[PDB]
Structure 1
Amino acid sequence: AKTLLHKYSDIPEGTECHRKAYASTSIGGATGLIVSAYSIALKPPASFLEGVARTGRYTFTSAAIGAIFGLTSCISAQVREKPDDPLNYFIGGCAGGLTLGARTRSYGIGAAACAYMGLTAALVKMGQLEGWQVFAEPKV
């Protein structure tokens, strides 16, 4: 829910990296659980234990990606002493992409995920800076 989002976003950028990594890990785990639920519903795994294995695999992948992103982004922001800089989010996104590539054991997946996740995270940081609204409330 938005409680996890608030728990992540309430902590300042370059402070308390362990807590931010924990919050990002929780967000990733929730995303992976939802993904595994939909996957099990639409593609039955033919066994209960196989379903548990698929759920654990997806959830661990997502949680690892989130933890790596949060830790790397916070550490970069703290080392550079430059909060409110999209470069930290780009570095965290590429770290998460390389984590995904290692998780699936594929170099092309790793490179593409690094590029795309870094770009997306930098865009998200720019949106937080400039006030871009994804779901705009009706104004006129």
Structure 2
Amino acid sequence: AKTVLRQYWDIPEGTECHRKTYATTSIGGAAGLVVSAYSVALKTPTSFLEGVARTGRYTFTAAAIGAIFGLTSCISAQVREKPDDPLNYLIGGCAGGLILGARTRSYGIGAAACAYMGLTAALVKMGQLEGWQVFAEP
């Protein structure tokens, strides 16, 4: 929902961050539920015992990406000066993609794409300025 997304942009104006951490999990959880729904098309063996097992691995990890991203956004904000910056969210994007290599035992892949996930997370946070629009009308 876009109404959930609108609540996210009002928080970084102040110093409060305890509401921001819960706001990120609602977006990250709902994004995981879409991927969890399309994984039903793969067909799970038996019923419920392995069916809910595939829903658990996707939704919990996707919510964990948002949960750390919400925390790291305010660790870089409270410690040291300066408000909202592209460099400030780049540190937040690094920790979010780091736990993908913690999901599967390979130490890389997700951690190898730490700069790849971090840059894309910064590009969305470039859109706070008036010089970026995702979907246009006039």
Q: TM-score normalised to the size of structure 1?
A: 0.88
The 3 A distance-change label for structure 1 pair 61 and 88 is same
Do 1:14 and 1:81's aligned partners in 2 also have CA atoms closer than 8 Å?
no
User: 2:98·2:110 contact (CA, 8 Å) conserved in 1?
Assistant: yes
Aligned counterparts of 1:33 and 1:83: Cα–Cα separation in 2: 33
Match of 2:118 in 1: 118
Q: Distance in 2 between matches of 1:33 and 1:3?
A: 18
Query: How far has the Cα of 1:104 moved from its partner?
Result: 2.3
Q: Which moved more, 1:26-35 or 1:5-14?
A: 5-14
SS in 2 for 1:129: coil
**Superposed CA offset, 1:73-111 (max 9, x none):** 122122123222011211111100112221223322232
Measure, in 2, the Cα distance between the counterparts of 1:113 and 1:23: 25
- In the alignment, the residues of structure 1 paired with residue 120 and residue 14 of structure 2 have an alpha-carbon distance, to the nearest angstrom, of 20
The structure-2 alpha-carbon separation of the partners of 1:106 and 1:14, relative to structure 1 and needing over 3 Å to count, comes to: farther
> 1:93: which partner in 2?
93
* Aligned mates of 2:81, 2:95 — CA distance in 1: 19
* Structure 1 unaligned residues grouped into runs of 5+: none
Q: What residue in structure 2 maps to residue 19 of structure 1?
A: 19
Give the structure, 1 or 2, with the largest relative contact order (CA under 8 Å, sep 6 or more): 1
Counterpart amino acid of residue 124 in structure 1: V
Once the two structures are overlaid, the 10-residue window that deviates more, 6-15 or 115-124, is: 6-15
Shift of 1:6: 1.5
- For residue 49 of structure 1, report the CA deviation from its aligned partner: 2.1
Q: Supply the AA of the counterpart residue of 1:63.
A: A
Unaligned runs of 5+ in 2: none
TM-score, normalising length: structure 2: 0.90
Which letter does structure 2 place at the counterpart of 1:45? T
1:34 alignment partner in structure 2: 34
The alpha-carbon deviation at position 129 of structure 1 amounts to 2.0
Letter of the 2:25 counterpart = T
Identity of aligned residues (%): 87
Moved more, 48-57 or 122-131: 122-131
Two-structure CA RMSD over aligned residues (Å): 1.6
> How many residue pairs end up in the alignment?
137
- Contact 1:74-1:88 at 8 Å conserved across structures: no
